[PDB]
Design a protein around this ligand. Structure first.
Ligand SMILES: Nc1ccn([C@H]2C[C@@H](OP(=O)(O)OC[C@H]3O[C@@H](n4cnc5c(=O)[nH]c(N)nc54)C[C@@H]3O)[C@H](CO)O2)c(=O)n1
Ligand SMILES: OC[C@H]1O[C@H](O[C@H]2O[C@H](CO)[C@@H](O)[C@H](O)[C@H]2O)[C@H](O)[C@@H](O)[C@@H]1O
Lengths: 124, 118
């Protein structure tokens, strides 16, 4: 008769392998979104909220962009994001990244009609 | 030419899979009925068993042998979809990082029930 301990392991345990762990999210994603084809993009943030909520930021808190422009906007709320940045040993075409999941406000630059995000400026 | 808007979506959007459908079935949780909800923990077995030595808390049923993990653990919640119908069980998969609460018993003292994630 299965023990209570083994029933729990059966119903609930699925330890991830190294290839499947979140720490490898950035390495897979920077590659599949084509951000490592020509050189290693040093830093890049992925945003996990809906597209509606991210597009909505273009009508939220207007802030200066790092480059000096003023078509940047910060979300009023924090958003689930994942920050990818090159590890010290990363070397093109073998780019490597440290994955950091977080909840932060995002700052995006907006342009066009409709006025939507066209550049990711910072997470704060 | 890919638009400026579409380029932003490619480099930066990753909003919100059949993981629950397969695991619920591989672990025999859909054998004669669809178990309605279940949670899988992706930490090592040793780290999960160590929770029985962490924060002692009351279980939902009032027992006093529940334990909450000091740290958040990577987990996946499996919830039956609205269309799910035995023998064609179907689940929505939601990943999270939360503290887990397990009831423990036995010698050695190990988890025997998943009570909640907080
Ligand atoms: P810190 O402030 O994270 O330093 C890292 C800097 O990197 C920047 N950053 C963060 N995410 C992105 C991104 O997706 N693209 C980009 N070009 N710069 C980013 C802004 C931060 O000041
Ligand atoms: O008795 C406590 C609860 O047990 C189940 O819910 C918990 O366990 C599930 C996995 O077995 C989790 O997915 C869920 O988040 C937990 O709260 C049961 O479904 C609940 O009705 C009980 O209250």
């Amino acid at each position: 008769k299965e023990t209570a301990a083994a029933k729990f392991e059966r119903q609930h345990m699925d330890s991830s392998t190294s290839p499947a762990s979140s720490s490898n999210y950035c390495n897979l994603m920077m590659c599949c979104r084509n951000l490592t084809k020509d050189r290693c993009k040093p830093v890049n943030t992925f945003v996990h909220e809906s597209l509606a909520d991210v597009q909505a930021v273009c009508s939220q808190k207007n802030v200066a962009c790092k480059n000096g422009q003023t078509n940047c906007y910060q979300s009023y709320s924090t958003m689930s994001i994942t920050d990818c940045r090159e590890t010290g040993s990363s070397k093109y075409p073998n780019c490597a990244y440290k994955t950091t999941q977080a909840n932060k406000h995002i700052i995006v630059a907006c342009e066009g009609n409709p006025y939507v995000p066209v550049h990711f400026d910072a997470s704060v």
